[model samples]
Target chain A: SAFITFEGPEGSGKTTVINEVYHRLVKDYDVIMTREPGGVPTGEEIRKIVLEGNDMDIRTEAMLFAASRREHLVLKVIPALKEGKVVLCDRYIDSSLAYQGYARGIGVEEVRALNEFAINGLYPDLTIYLNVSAEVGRERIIKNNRLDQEDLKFHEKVIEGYQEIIHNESQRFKSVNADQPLENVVEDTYQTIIKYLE
Target chain B: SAFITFEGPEGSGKTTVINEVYHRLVKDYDVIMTREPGGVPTGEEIRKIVLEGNDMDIRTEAMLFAASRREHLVLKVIPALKEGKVVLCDRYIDSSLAYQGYARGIGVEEVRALNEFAINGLYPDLTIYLNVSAEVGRERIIKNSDQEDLKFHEKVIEGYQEIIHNESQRFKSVNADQPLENVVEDTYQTIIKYLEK
Candidate 1:
């Protein structure tokens, strides 16, 4: 059983590609798909708190996300991992690293420390990083009417942050070029996973 | 303006003594008294989540406390402090150090790191620790129909002791074994002298 995570900036086609990959993986593997800030009742409650517009400080937002992640791991992820199921998590620790840590100016090391404390040393076996340019991602985000309609500079910073993380932890990550067609990106992710599983 | 916190085990008469101290201090100084987990609107909502009790893990509990504390500090306590009010919080970071850190077996240093990130260097100017025996505190808890058992109360005392020993510079311990009026008077005098300083 492997704990695999998907990470990228918003509108990077992570959700779409993860779903397609999950469908193919589930045919042979005992797979459990989940997402952070959710996947359990308590975590769902915290997800609402985080997503709902509030005057929350950046630190408060970070803590809430960590809290939700802890509950999600305890109540959902670890159980499936123990049962010898492949856990496909849509987003995980690296999202905080990019969004809150880098984009929000909270310092990546600071946010990573908080998340490490929260997860209690549960790191993924493999992380699939969907690489997409800020220009391409922004167009998709605006088209989807997503809430994260941040400026181009912020989105650019998020990509830069993810690049730094991937470079630092090269052994753990497998990068996919997501600027291609939808089918090509999904096929690339599927091939990456199949090769990794080998 | 100063930020003061009152900390003790349950039934150490922290609330009663703090109220009396607040009454006396407000007569001359701009004082804003509040408690954690319920100091601000968002914090109150988080407080309900904590107190209402679902099957929350100890680590989740620690994070929730830190989350609520972050909102409380940003939305209420720090703003009051900035406006030149003496923010007398009923409990602060040390409570987590005692309860979740020492008592709950999460480690004091671990919880302290989380809280340091939450408060972001906003340490209290002074902390008034009410020293009481576990036996006395347990008896008072039982009398008040509180749910803490004897063993938990004992652990809480150990936490309080650790706080006093570890945070010597920030903490001033007051013996709470005296009569109610004397306890109040001693706390009042302590704050008065602290404000004078």
Candidate 2:
């Protein structure tokens, strides 16, 4: 049983890769694939946080986000991990490390500190980095009409941020070149994940 | 229940002024003077003091302060407020904003965000800022302070100045650079201006 998170810059074909990887692994391994804040059961406080967050401060909003994240980890994912199932999360705190921490320009360590308070050192067993070139990633995005030039610029920062985060915590992240064809990317990803699970 | 908070740079005579004000007010009205984590039941859990705190991350430390701030406000201050007492806090969120956020270079807006989570829109009715000049304050605090401490003290004062510039509507600044008696009179009158209503 392990907690594994999948990370990539926007339009990295992460969702598609994870889907393929999930199915391939589910066939053989006792695994559960979910997304971050996936089925968060910290109901009442979160309901208030969502509604009351109408005009809250950004860092405060992140705190409540982290608070809600904590409950989800406690109530949902911890149990699954304890039950000896591979908990494959599509995105996790690292998503925040990229999007909120760096891309939003709040300073990575500041946001990382907030998440530290939330997670209390509960890091993923492995974070599978779906490494795709920003150019290739944007090409995929344009086809789907996903983002503008501004958003594209932001997504680029997310990639840079992810690279730094992975560099900072090299032991946790395992990267794969998703810029290649889907079949090869999937093969590379599936191969990378099995070492931990098997 | 009125929530009044006092703020000042370390040598600004904040504590002495607050102490005097509490005495003057307490004679006729129900009033309480407190600094946070003092007389707070949740002090042990949230106000935890130790060397371990030195190693804690800044945001985590900010979160801890905010959490304790929450309980002190909710449990202690609010109760006194409901009972029709004047709760005179020695220092409040602004202290953290200045010392930790601005002086410590943590970004005032970022730390303010964390604190806003703790207070949850519950701001003080009045925040009396005991404004003192660095020269006079240095004299007042001089049992021989280091140049390094003076540098941080100046930064703390600068931070509060910036804060009050933006929040003048809530922050009533009184010059504490004057003689103690006149400072006390000005501050007392200021307190009367609010409490009389």
Candidate 3:
């Protein structure tokens, strides 16, 4: 019953570390790694709306994310979990809490309520939070040529938002110092999951 | 400051009544009448998704409607209301309560909460509920050649009842079982009194 989620601001190496760990774990266990906004066909369509950068209201954006997540959770994640596989989801509810709720001024509680309704109580068993400074994350984002790079100030708020969420939900989260080298970050993540599996 | 909404199941003659009243009111007042799922630009896009008959979950459908409503409220309805126009919305949040909440088993309170969040505390000043029996509505729907079956139509009527019970104060029920002209007259009189106050 290992339902782990990878969470952090963009360019915090969440996807990189998850991919590295996933390759290692899949050899030994029945493991599935998926990401939100594109985990399923419906979610992929919703993701197109989100990434297209239309002039949408913040509430509409939040609702679209929730809709996509509902489809992904009902179609992909929950089924994989039901089959007794270790499901590692990248950027689940916490991303919305930080990006839309906290940083975008939607109120974390309100966004949490919306997501809770969408998820209907299917929370991650373990969440690995990759901690990186806002400045560092922004630099990595620029270096990686990502298209959705918001302003640095926005990223700063996102980092702060994640801090608030991690502080409140510390028991469910395991914080990793993501300022390290890729190899070290991968190693630390691998060890953390090993302990959880045991 | 009139933010009026018309509520009823399909084939309940709500559209006909609203149109008749709208024509008379526009002669004297600055009035804007619109309907949901296609009122604003963004809402029109969302309407296409809903009407395209995609195999979406009930919850997804509810969320899409809320998203469209948020855009329609912020873009069209609220702006028109602020300009001191009588914004007569053909359908609004109450429709969701009946169709998705009570009918689809999503729970009225849950859908209400979502719409409240979407609406951002902006509720209709008056809701004109066109009351029609389930059997009568089904016949009207069949006569009109709509695609939805009888069971869904029956559920929609039950939803309207739940809405009327829950929102009694804001709602003004009119017997739509009357002739079309009588229904339109009743609705027009109700609006005139509301506007007078």
Best by TM-score: 1
In candidate 1, what are the lDDT values of residues B64-123, reduced to their tens digit?
A: 889899888888888888898899899889989888988888987789889888998899
Q: For candidate 1, what is the DockQ-based docking class?
A: medium
What class would a CAPRI assessor give candidate 2's docking?
incorrect
Question: By descending TM-score, how would the candidates be arranged?
Answer: 1, 3, 2
lDDT of 3 at A129: 94
What TM-score does prediction 2 earn? 0.56
Worst 10 residues of 3 chain A by lDDT: A144-153
* Winner by DockQ between candidate 2 and candidate 1: 1
Q: Per-residue alpha-carbon lDDT of model 2 for B91-112, expressed as tens digits?
A: 8999999998899897887777
Candidate 3 chain B has its poorest 10 consecutive residues by lDDT at: B45-54
Q: Where does candidate 3 stray beyond 4 Å?
A: A145-150, B143-154
Q: Candidate 3, residues A76-117: lDDT per residue as tens digits?
A: 888888899999999889998998899999999889888887
Clashing pairs in 3: none
Native-referenced DockQ of model 2 = 0.05
lDDT of 2 by residue, A1-198 (tens): 889889998768888889999999998888998874576533233435446434444444555456556666776788998899998888778987887789878678877866765676799999999999989988888875556789889979999999889888888899999899878988998998998776
Model 1 clash pairs are none
List candidate 1 stretches off by more than 4 Å.
Answer: A142-150, B143-148
